[model samples]
Target: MLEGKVKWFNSEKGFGFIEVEGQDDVFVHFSAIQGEGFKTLEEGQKVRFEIVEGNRGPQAANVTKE
Candidate 1:
């Protein structure tokens, strides 16, 4: 997984973006967050996640808050 920070997250939309050093923002879906309960990310929160080829290109997966 790669390290990054949350850029923005819309809980209602269940999606967000993450900022990785020297890289473009990666799309993040609630399903990508690692947890058992309701998943959501706060803006500016530190996180580590994996990047994969999504329907729309680069996206985050297995995201876990730091």
Candidate 2:
């Protein structure tokens, strides 16, 4: 698992970026978030997730709010 902080998230757009150390921002889609109901993220929020290769670039998976 990797730890990082939420750089910013657009709940309306259903996407966001996670700030990880020593690397570029990781992309996070709503589908990647693990949970029921409306999945969303907030700015500067701490989270944990796995990194994987997405269609475009790096994406965050199994995201859990911390």
Candidate 3:
């Protein structure tokens, strides 16, 4: 799993991005989140997740706090 910070999140929007090391910012959605209910992911929150190609573009999957 790649590790990074939440970077930003909008609860109402239910979307966010990750600041992964040495890589372009990654996009993530609440529906893709793992573990217990991920009500929101705050800015600067550390996390780990998997990257998968999606119809739209690259997406984060199985996101977990570290």
Candidate 4:
């Protein structure tokens, strides 16, 4: 798992961007979040996730906010 911080999040839209510790900004979609009750995430929240290839760039999967 990779650790990162949320750069931005759009609660209404259920999407966001994460700034990985040593990687480029990554896009995160609501669908990629696992489990339930992930209504919205917040900026600066610490998280762990798996990096995966997105349509345009890297994306986060199985994300867990800390």
The candidate scoring highest on TM-score is: 1
How far in Å is the alpha carbon of 63 misplaced in model 2? 0.6
Give per-model TM-scores.
0.90, 0.88, 0.86, 0.83
| Residues 1-66, model 4: lDDT tens digits | 988898999988999899976668888888877667755788999888888884776778888875
Deviation of model 1 at 32, angstroms: 0.6
Better candidate by TM-score, 1 or 2: 1
Please report, in order, the local distance difference test score of every candidate based on alpha carbons.
0.91, 0.91, 0.85, 0.83
User: For residues 1-66, could you state the per-residue lDDT of candidate 2 as single tens digits?
Assistant: 999999999999999899998989998998888777789999999999999984777799999894
Writing each residue's lDDT as its tens digit, candidate 1 over 11-38 gives: 9989989999899999999999997788
Q: Which structure is stronger by TM-score: 1 or 3?
A: 1
Please state the error at residue 49 of candidate 3 in Å. Answer: 0.2
Question: Model 3, which residues run further than 4 Å from truth?
Answer: none
Relative to the unseen true structure, what is the C-alpha lDDT of residue 1 in candidate 3, on a scale of 0 to 100?
A: 83
- Model 4 residue runs over 4 Å out of place are 54-56
For model 1, state the Cα shift of residue 33 in Å.
0.7
RMSD of candidate 1 to the truth, in angstroms, is 1.3
TM-score of model 1 (CA atoms):
0.90
Model 1 poorest ten-residue lDDT run: 50-59
Judge candidate 1 at residue 65 and give its lDDT: 90
TM-score of 4: 0.83
